[PDB]
Amino acid sequence: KIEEGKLVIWINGDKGYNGLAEVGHKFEHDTGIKVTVEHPDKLEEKFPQVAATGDGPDIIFWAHDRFGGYAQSGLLAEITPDKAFQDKLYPFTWDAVRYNGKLIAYPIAVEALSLIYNKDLLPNPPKTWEEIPALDKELKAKGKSALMFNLQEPYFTWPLIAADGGYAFKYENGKYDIKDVGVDNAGAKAGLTFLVDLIKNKHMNADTDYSIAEAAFNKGETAMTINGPWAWSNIDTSKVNYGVTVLPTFKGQPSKPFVGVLSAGINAASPNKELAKEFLENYLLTDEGLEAVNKDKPLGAVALKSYEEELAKDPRIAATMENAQKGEIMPNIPQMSAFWYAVRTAVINAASGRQTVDAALAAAQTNAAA
Numbered sequence: 001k002i003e004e005g006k007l008v009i010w011i012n013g014d015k016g017y018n019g020l021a022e023v024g025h026k027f028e029h030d031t032g033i034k035v036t037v038e039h040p041d042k043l044e045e046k047f048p049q050v051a052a053t054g055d056g057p058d059i060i061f062w063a064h065d066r067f068g069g070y071a072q073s074g075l076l077a078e079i080t081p082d083k084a085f086q087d088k089l090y091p092f093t094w095d096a097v098r099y100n101g102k103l104i105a106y107p108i109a110v111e112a113l114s115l116i117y118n119k120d121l122l123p124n125p126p127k128t129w130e131e132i133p134a135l136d137k138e139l140k141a142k143g144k145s146a147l148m149f150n151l152q153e154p155y156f157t158w159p160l161i162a163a164d165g166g167y168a169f170k171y172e173n174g175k176y177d178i179k180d181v182g183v184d185n186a187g188a189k190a191g192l193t194f195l196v197d198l199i200k201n202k203h204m205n206a207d208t209d210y211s212i213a214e215a216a217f218n219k220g221e222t223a224m225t226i227n228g229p230w231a232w233s234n235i236d237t238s239k240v241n242y243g244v245t246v247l248p249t250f251k252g253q254p255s256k257p258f259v260g261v262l263s264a265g266i267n268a269a270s271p272n273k274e275l276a277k278e279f280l281e282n283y284l285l286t287d288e289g290l291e292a293v294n295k296d297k298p299l300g301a302v303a304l305k306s307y308e309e310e311l312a313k314d315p316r317i318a319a320t321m322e323n324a325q326k327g328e329i330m331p332n333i334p335q336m337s338a339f340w341y342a343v344r345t346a347v348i349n350a351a352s353g354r355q356t357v358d359a360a361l362a363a364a365q366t367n368a369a370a
């Protein structure tokens with residue numbers, strides 16, 4: 001059961017959870033209510049596990065794509081923001097947290113992947129994926145590599161898979177057809193094949209994960225990485241001279257990252273819904289609230305109009321939105337979890353050589369479909 005008279009908040013370990021706790025700290029001073037912020041591993045799977053029993057955090061933070069599944073399972077309270085507060089956030093951010101005609105979470109920030117590059121190693125970053133193999137060769141002469149990013153999470157490879165025609169669920173008639181999956185079409189296969197060939201030709205390592213890729217880029221060992229605004233902070237610290245720019249094209253086509261809207265839902269079983277509404281609307285979703293979290297780890301382009309007008313100036317935000325525009329806002333339908341699981345297994349198996357690309361994506365096609 002969930003404890004009354006306090007706030008428990010879950011947010012992913014890559015985000016500014018210390019900044020968020022700082023906002024909770026102020027809340028505690030003003031109200032006497034303790035706010036405990038936690039970042040459980042794989043919380044996107046852990047939340048529905050514990051919330052299914054009326055347990056868990058009062059507030060859950062994650063990209064909007066998971067929230068449809070959460071609402072369908074009856075895990076999320078409907079949020080009741082008045083028209084005034086609604087007018088404070090961008091309309092399209094409200095759209096991402098609308099399920100079955102109901103708002104099921106507070107939109108916080110728009111996230112998209114960008115190409116992050118070392119200006120000292122790479123004054124002009126590559127415009128195409130195709131030129132990366134040769135680039136890596138040059139850098140291998142300095143004992144360095146061209147590009148490292150997390151291969152354990154399909155989120156990071158998806159931009160390349162969707163570039164030439166890969167897609168999740170066919171969107172027709174304003175609705176998604178959940179039996180029409182596009183993870184094994186010619187476009188998907190060519191994208192994954194190119195990744196697998198990078199590994200096969202020693203330009204990348206199939207074991208590369210988030211931590212390895214981050215360490216490598218921040219220590220100057222690799223010229224490029226692929227990541228979101230949250231990662232900019234640790235790069236700032238390491239004082240590597242970096243830039244953020246458009247993802248490389250593939251086969252002449254833009255990489256198409258799946259765009260997420262970090263959102264805050266309220267546990268349906270929480271006895272602290274009023275507390276949570278207060279905290280979210282009048283502490284977090286203010287200039288000073290978002291600033292506090294942003295200082296810890298950049299959120300991207302925030303949904304709060306007032307604040308995002310300062311942030312849109314930053315050229316890193318501009319690159320994020322350019323990439324967001326070339327990609328697509330994730331669906332929030334409940335089948336998204338099966339999709340992500342399917343594509344994760346496929347990417348990993350093909351990367352490690354455990355399966356051919358065709359066999360990996362054929363299985364993923366079956367698993368993603370209902």
Ligand SMILES: OC[C@H]1O[C@H](O[C@H]2[C@H](O)[C@@H](O)[C@@H](O)O[C@@H]2CO)[C@H](O)[C@@H](O)[C@@H]1O
Nearest residue numbers: 014044063065066153154155156260340
């Ligand atoms: O890799 C599958 C994964 O992709 C997305 O997760 C992102 C998340 O949106 C970002 O905030 C980032 O910080 O972490 C994840 C990448 O590791 C989907 O949102 C998620 O549901 C899905 O499992």
Ligand SMILES: [Ca+2]
Nearest residue numbers: 325326327328
């Ligand atoms: Ca678009």
Ligand SMILES: [Cl-]
Nearest residue numbers: 150152209210
């Ligand atoms: Cl990882």
